[PDB]
């Protein structure tokens, strides 16, 4: 019944010959520069672990640490602070260059090695019997920034990663301030890289990225800015100018940001969260806002292939980009379902409905 | 019927996964359920014992001299270990066929450790490495046994596939129109039917094993089902491989049950009559089938283990062999425990 559809029915589905294989629940928020909710899928206020999609907020805490400007981090270094990188040789080399700028050593890092986020990098490592170390962490740039901040304020590099350290107090405050939340409305766990990681309502992740893009618009327009808005504009610019540092060759985030050529930034979180900050455009005005836009997505069950398909679908439904810009992402939008003998066996479909119908149809967030 | 397995990071919900499960008696009557026990479901590799039955019921196949380990490989989603490829080649030699006759293709191994070994050695898998290679050699054997020709043995209009289609519907106790068909990753037809009927197939496998052990008069079909059960339970390493759930589950239970994975996170178990089954309120064998709605395999194995604990199947000591699958490791890159898995579902009876 098309006239009784509900947020509880917002799915992405895979089929085999038209027979349902898997279904995945989708949650999404689309917000304006003040965080007002414009569009939604599923539960746009779902309490959600932002994971690596929080990294621009952690980069802001680093860049707002007094004395950090003195180390001479450049835009590619800031983009690495914002990264879940593929551990390509260029990412490891930049991590070592950043450690040299702060006179620190790989032994000061409190992140650990893991298999690469890139299948091709991981194949190179397997071929050479290479065991990844701390410097190879997808979060290595964030950790070097946290060490830089610790040294800058004279707090000591020992325990920079623990909640009692002032660098983590700064991160905690900065995340809550960008979300416009009380500290008690942000929950904290521990991440794969061994830092504190926040959880907050999904719409507030959209709000962070709307603030990033709004700051970029203010900077480009030559508006007078707070130190905080200038730092946010710098983070947006660094991610957009160096998208290969944010992820790497063949990665969604890098391909998305190269396709859009400065119009937006986007970032993956582990367990299938995504956030995008969109600069004011004809598309944002058509959506009914006079400023920048933020988008956040979660796939309930954590599937990354589905996340990238949904994010690309939602950009198409919001009219963000042109068909020609979005076509660079076609392999992610409609993932290949081809068997071991080259036969197409199925596909992906998007039985979800954006909401902004009878007044009597309740839209219960689910 | 809103039944989930949930993962957390420091008590904060990370992912949640919808669970469907059916527990059935030997006639397919529903005893217990999670979610929607009649969900239309692609059985994928969990249909393999029904396809093995079609092969074993083909006139002339007994002549090739397949042994129990060969039948276990017909029932397998194997890890493509060197021992699986060697048994595939031995089975091809028993039917005087060659790897070129197979119409399945190579894929990355279902074992990360095997796959890493292949990457290290620049090895490109071929048809003989397919997880389905044993099923394909059996389908070639059945085609050659009835003189149907090996060309197109995998196509729906080949008599081997008409035999498979009918045999699946018969074991489900469904009309042909109630079973849907797609194409699998190995390029064979693959069925979909209500989840409880996957449990019914496995209840029939275990019931057949009980009837055989008891010296009951059996149809050729019940004798063949008993043989398939015995082959899987005797050679569980052929069904999957080192470290795989299916192999560890069947070794732990030492003949008391068989279990099999389907791709995209289905699972089926056939349980021989026991003190546990009698306590659950049935006088015969039982079948269990599970689907994780979103396809997550780590969650499937956690749920299946949890369900065996809820049903009292095995002893605590037997089920402790599966502890790493029951409560999967949530340890970060620096050895710190960050989270875990919870089962906020309730079996309904
Ligand atoms: Cl590149
Ligand atoms: Zn991290
Ligand atoms: Zn197969």
Author numbering:
A (entry chain AAA): -3 to 352, 358 to 367
B (entry chain BBB): 4 to 352
How do the authors describe this structure?
Rhizobium etli, a nitrogen-fixing bacterial symbiont of legume plants, encodes an essential l-asparaginase (ReAV) with no sequence homology to known enzymes with this activity. High-resolution crystal structures of ReAV show indeed a structurally distinct, dimeric enzyme, with some resemblance to glutaminases and β-lactamases. The active site of ReAV, deduced from structural comparisons and confirmed by mutagenesis experiments, contains a highly specific Zn2+ binding site without a catalytic role. There are two Ser-Lys tandems, all connected through a network of H-bonds to the Zn center, and three tightly bound water molecules near Ser48, which clearly indicate the catalytic nucleophile.
The orthorhombic (OP) and monoclinic MP1/MP2 forms show similar packing pattern with solvent content of 49.4–52.6%, whereas the monoclinic form MC, with a significantly different arrangement of the dimers in the unit cell, has 53.2% solvent content. In the close vicinity of the Ser48 hydroxyl, there is a characteristic, almost tetrahedral pattern of three closely-spaced water molecules w2, w3, w4, visible in all crystal structures, except MP2. These waters must have extremely strong H-bonds with the Oγ atom of Ser48, as indicated by the O···O distances, which in the highest-resolution structure OP refined to 2.2–2.5 Å. The water molecules are also tightly H-bonded to each other. Water w3 is also H-bonded to w1 coordinated by the Zn2+ cation. The attraction of the three water molecules w2-w3-w4 by the Ser48 side chain is a clear evidence of this polarization. In the absence of a substrate, the arrangement of w2-w3-w4 might mimic the tetrahedral transition state of the catalytic event.
